[PDB]
């Protein structure tokens, strides 16, 4: 079934680095809006 | 099977030449001359 | 057909285990005398 | 506890004010319950300005339960500028063993770590045994570690980092045979050194190649090479001639002797 | 197919996990800068 279990394997993989693409501008909003005081 | 075909030369391509000392007879000569240099050329290509 | 799946190294272990055997076999001074640590090659 | 949690996750401006009180260094040198410094913690985690704060207050290269330093942890981490700041303190910290005696270069090349191999190796990090007697590279090859081992083959000192194994190991062999046993294309970046060319014209007729064979020797590197079904380093020029030339130098010379004995009996009796 | 499909996949994955090693690194610097008061 190779011929299609990589075909699958990558349209795991492929909605797995969408997922962690939109996840990246998540931490990246955290840190434009943090409040940070004193800790700097 | 190479240490068995070197006994078969050996043991027959001396009676195919005992004559050098010891006269044999001539069927018995040439019966152990057809199996002596069939031998010896079989045996060749594991050399 | 399955010979042919291995013969590019079969070609090279049988040479690899006659000269080891060789080796095995041979004196140390002979081999000391013979083999050689550099060749060079003119193309 | 709490300089160990500022100093862990690098919170600088919190080991000013709790080290604001430098009356006595007990916290600045303290336990814990893994047995870790805060100098520790901050080079664990890789924090460059933290590991430099406490060694400019007053820290100690102490060790952890385990046996570790603060340069075992950065090495572990391959936190290149934590390391960089322990060497330009104390690089007389370098040589320092664990519990199971590996010197900081065993841990830089067991986790991977190229560019941390590098500093402490181009260093004078002791090249040594660990007490499961494995060198650093030992280490580097039973974990398929690509980058350090090229790293090392690279590096100004690989004619010392070879040397040093113990030969009644069952586990640990000569590295050239752990090379070809786990990292073959190691091995095919080791023998294109082997190959010399002499003029950078092939066409010539004063041209010429030359092949190097110290690392075939200990037929020990061939017969690793095709126990472990290495076809594309049998295929490789330094192999080729290496066979060649051991063929021309007595192999031929008694297989020729060997057929002649045979080869006069055979034609005389035709 | 194989024989490079699954080249594109290292690819895929060499570009995941890069990307991966550049967000831990925005993770480790929200600890470093965050306020903390009243969990200390």
Same mark, same amino acid.
């Given at each position: ?40 | ?47 | ?10 070609? !090279? ?26 060749? !060079?090659?003119?193309? | ?270």
């Amino acid at each position: 079934s190779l011929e299609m279990e990589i075909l699958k394997q990558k349209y795991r993989l492929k909605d797995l680095t969408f997922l962690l693409e939109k996840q990246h501008e998540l931490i990246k909003l955290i840190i434009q809006k943090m409040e940070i005081i004193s800790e700097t | 099977i190479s240490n068995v075909l070197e006994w078969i030369i050996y043991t027959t391509g001396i009676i195919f030449v005992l004559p050098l000392f010891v006269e044999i007879p001539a069927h018995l000569q040439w019966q152990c001359g057809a199996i002596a240099v069939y031998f010896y050329w079989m045996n060749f290509l594991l050399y | 057909a399955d010979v042919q799946k291995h013969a590019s190294l079969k070609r !090279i272990a049988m040479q690899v285990e006659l000269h080891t055997s060789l080796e095995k076999k041979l004196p140390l001074w002979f081999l000391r005398k013979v083999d050689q640590k550099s060749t !060079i090659v003119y193309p | 506890s709490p300089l160990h949690f500022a100093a862990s996750y690098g919170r600088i401006n919190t080991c000013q004010r709790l080290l604001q009180d430098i009356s006595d260094t007990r916290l600045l040198n303290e336990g814990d319950l893994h047995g870790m410094t805060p100098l520790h913690l901050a080079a664990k985690n890789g924090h460059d300005k933290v590991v430099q704060l406490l060694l400019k207050k007053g820290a100690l290269f102490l060790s952890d339960h385990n046996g570790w330093t603060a340069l075992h942890h950065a090495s572990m981490g391959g936190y290149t500028q934590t390391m960089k700041v322990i060497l330009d303190t104390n690089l007389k910290c370098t040589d320092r063993l664990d519990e199971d005696g590996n010197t900081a270069l065993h841990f830089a090349a067991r986790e991977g770590h190229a560019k941390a191999v590098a500093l402490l190796l181009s260093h004078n990090a002791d090249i040594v045994l660990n007490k499961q007697q494995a060198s650093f590279l030992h280490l580097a090859l039973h974990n398929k570690r690509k980058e350090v081992v090229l790293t090392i083959i690279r590096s100004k000192r690989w004619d010392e980092c070879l040397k040093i194994f113990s030969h009644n190991s069952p586990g640990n062999k000569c590295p050239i045979t752990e090379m070809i046993e786990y990292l073959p294309e190691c091995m095919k970046v080791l023998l294109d050194f082997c190959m010399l060319h002499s003029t950078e014209d092939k066409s010539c007729r004063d041209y010429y190649i030359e092949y190097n064979f110290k690392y075939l020797q200990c037929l020990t590197a061939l017969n690793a090479m095709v126990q472990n079904n290495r076809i594309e380093l049998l295929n490789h020029p330094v192999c080729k001639e290496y066979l060649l030339m051991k063929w021309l130098a007595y192999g031929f010379r008694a297989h020729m002797m060997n057929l002649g004995s045979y080869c006069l009996g055979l034609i005389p009796m035709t």
